[PDB]
Amino acid sequence: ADVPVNLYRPNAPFIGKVISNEPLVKEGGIGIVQHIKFDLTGGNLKYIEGQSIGIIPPGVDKNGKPEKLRLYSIASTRHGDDVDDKTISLCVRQLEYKHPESGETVYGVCSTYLTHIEPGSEVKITGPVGKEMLLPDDPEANVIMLATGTGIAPMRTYLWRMFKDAERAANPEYQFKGFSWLVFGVPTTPNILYKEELEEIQQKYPDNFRLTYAISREQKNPQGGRMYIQDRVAEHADQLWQLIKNEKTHTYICGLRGMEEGIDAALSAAAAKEGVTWSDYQKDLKKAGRWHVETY
Numbered sequence: 657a658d659v660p661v662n663l664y665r666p667n668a669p670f671i672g673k674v675i676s677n678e679p680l681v682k683e684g685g686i687g688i689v690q691h692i693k694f695d696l697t698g699g700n701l702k703y704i705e706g707q708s709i710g711i712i713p714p715g716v717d718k719n720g721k722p723e724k725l726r727l728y729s730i731a732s733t734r735h736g737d738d739v740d741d742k743t744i745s746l747c748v749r750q751l752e753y754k755h756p757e758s759g760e761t762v763y764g765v766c767s768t769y770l771t772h773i774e775p776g777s778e779v780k781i782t783g784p785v786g787k788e789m790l791l792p793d794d795p796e797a798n799v800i801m802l803a804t805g806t807g808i809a810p811m812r813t814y815l816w817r818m819f820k821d822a823e824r825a826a827n828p829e830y831q832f833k834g835f836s837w838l839v840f841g842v843p844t845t846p847n848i849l850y851k852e853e854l855e856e857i858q859q860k861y862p863d864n865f866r867l868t869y870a871i872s873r874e875q876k877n878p879q880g881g882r883m884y885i886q887d888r889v890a891e892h893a894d895q896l897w898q899l900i901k902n903e904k905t906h907t908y909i910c911g912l913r914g915m916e917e918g919i920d921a922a923l924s925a926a927a928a929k930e931g932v933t934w935s936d937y938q939k940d941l942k943k944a945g946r947w948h949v950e951t952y
């Protein structure tokens with residue numbers, strides 16, 4: 657052990673308490689993505705970067721059976737947002753879809769519950785879960801973050817642990833010296849979750865953190881379509897591949913499914929110029945624990 661896993665399971669979950677539920681999507685954006693913080697005092701839920709936790713929503717489904725957990729990537733570092741080892745945070749988007757056929761807009765159960773949760777409320781938290789999105793202990797490692805929407809959550813945990821002054825002071829063991837690159841694909845600028853903090857990290861650390869955005873409603877790719885994270889990985893395909901070649905580099909992909917086939921096609925052309933088949937180099941990176949994916 658070292659990596660915490662399942663200190664709380666579904667049968668007897670941690671009764672956490674909401675401290676804050678703040679909006680991430682600013683005025684003019686598409687959606688509601690909230691940053692919810694939960695009090696962890698009273699128990700022993702310790703968690704690490706890249707992990708997730710479950711939230712069991714209240715109520716029953718359409719069949720009468722209780723609602724089962726929904727996994728959410730932790731948006732905070734092990735220390736929490738206030739760097740006190742007392743809280744855990746999440747970056748939750750309210751699932752919403754206008755009809756598979758009929759009855760109009762539908763709202764996701766756990767996501768709506770969470771995006772509208774009030775401070776002081778008790779929540780059923782399980783977790784931590786996941787050994788697939790962990791950050792290397794090596795401060796000199798390079799890390800490529802490929803995020804879309806709520807997949808910004810685990811990237812935030814790496815970036816804050818690496819770049820927040822208080823996190824640095826709390827971690828003498830991890831004083832990040834490498835290069836991290838976030839390619840974040842959101843539909844509008846107000847939809848850039850944690851824009852202020854992401855940008856102020858890139859300002860303090862120009863040579864250590866590069867920030868690339870693919871904003872769908874304000875940018876077009878070289879083919880005239882809307883700008884997606886794949887288009888962005890495509891225009892920087894060579895550089896991205898030149899970094900992937902390093903033994904210390906780690907790549908993280910997170911967000912809803914669908915972005916993986918474009919990131920691959922792009923990194924394939926890059927890699928093919930030097931004689932290597934990306935998919936086979938990738939297979940080896942996964943076995944090596946250096947190519948991390950979590951799409952949902």
Ligand SMILES: Cc1cc2nc3c(=O)[nH]c(=O)nc-3n(C[C@H](O)[C@H](O)[C@H](O)COP(=O)(O)OP(=O)(O)OC[C@H]3O[C@@H](n4cnc5c(N)ncnc54)[C@H](O)[C@@H]3O)c2cc1C
Nearest residue numbers: 726727728729747748749751753764765766767806809952
């Ligand atoms: C490891 C992991 C990490 C995750 N991290 C996050 C995170 O950080 N943030 C986050 O917001 N979510 C995250 N999720 C997703 C989250 O677990 C829930 O799946 C999501 O919040 C929706 O659950 P819900 O309770 O709102 O909806 P439910 O009520 O369970 O929704 C039920 C159904 O809605 C559906 N559906 C979704 N979109 C459509 C559509 N467009 N058209 C038709 N049907 C549709 C599917 O049929 C699904 O079965 C993560 C999932 C996993 C596995």
Ligand SMILES: NC(=O)c1ccc[n+]([C@@H]2O[C@H](COP(=O)([O-])OP(=O)(O)OC[C@H]3O[C@H](n4cnc5c(N)ncnc54)[C@H](OP(=O)(O)O)[C@@H]3O)[C@@H](O)[C@H]2O)c1
Nearest residue numbers: 686687688689750752804805806841842843847872873884
């Ligand atoms: N209206 C409400 O009050 C309410 C509440 C909650 C949520 N909504 C949900 O909130 C969400 C926004 O959250 P966010 O800030 O986390 O951003 P986001 O939606 O995660 O960003 C991801 C991207 O997926 C799209 N994507 C589309 N086509 C694609 C393709 N070919 N390849 C790859 N990706 C594609 C979207 O583009 P385009 O859409 O531009 O094509 C979008 O920019 C919305 O999707 C919304 O439906 C509504």
